[PDB]
């Protein structure tokens, strides 16, 4: 299975938030390792991993994420245990306050790989 949560994003935030920053944010918040995978689970697009950082400087809307997109964020260092993967639903809401990017407080445990 997978952990699940909703990200509350303002519209202006999807349009300004850089992918590189989004990755750091999710990694640190839920304690993933350095090597990670970020996939659009909606349409199965590998958007970022520890080997494909080419869209680093693009914003979230520039890589075609939007309201209702589901992102799957995985642990790719995965020696023996891994940080459990999480599926995050992007809730782009009007009118959330400007520059809102609220990540859900979810429990993401270590599990056997």
Author numbering: 440 to 552
Question: What does the article say, verbatim?
Answer:
The Sumo-specific E1 enzyme [the heterodimeric complex between Uba2 and Aos1 (yeast; termed Sae1-Uba2 in mammals)] initiates the process by first catalyzing adenylation of the Sumo C-terminus, which next becomes linked by a thioester bond to Uba2's catalytic cysteine. A transthiolation reaction ensues during which Sumo is transferred from Uba2 to the catalytic cysteine of the dedicated Sumo E2 conjugating enzyme, Ubc9. In addition, for both yeast and human Uba2, the ufd has been implicated in Ubc9 recruitment. Therefore, to obtain a more detailed understanding of Uba2's ufd interactions with Ubc9 and to obtain broad insights into how E1-E2 specificity is established in general, we performed structural analysis of the Uba2ufd-Ubc9 complex from S. cerevisiae.
Like ubiquitin and Sumo, the Uba2ufd adopts a modified β-grasp fold. Uba2ufd consists of a twisted 5-stranded antiparallel β-sheet on one side, one 3-turn α-helix on the opposite side of the sheet, and two peripheral short helices. The β-sheet and connecting loops form one V-shaped surface. The two V-like structures are adjacent to each other, and together form a W-shaped surface. The structure of the Uba2ufd is nearly identical in the complex as on its own (0.47 Å rmsd). The Uba2ufd C-terminal “V” is minimized relative to the corresponding regions in ubiquitin and NEDD8 E1s, which would be unable to accommodate the Ubc9 β1β2-loop.
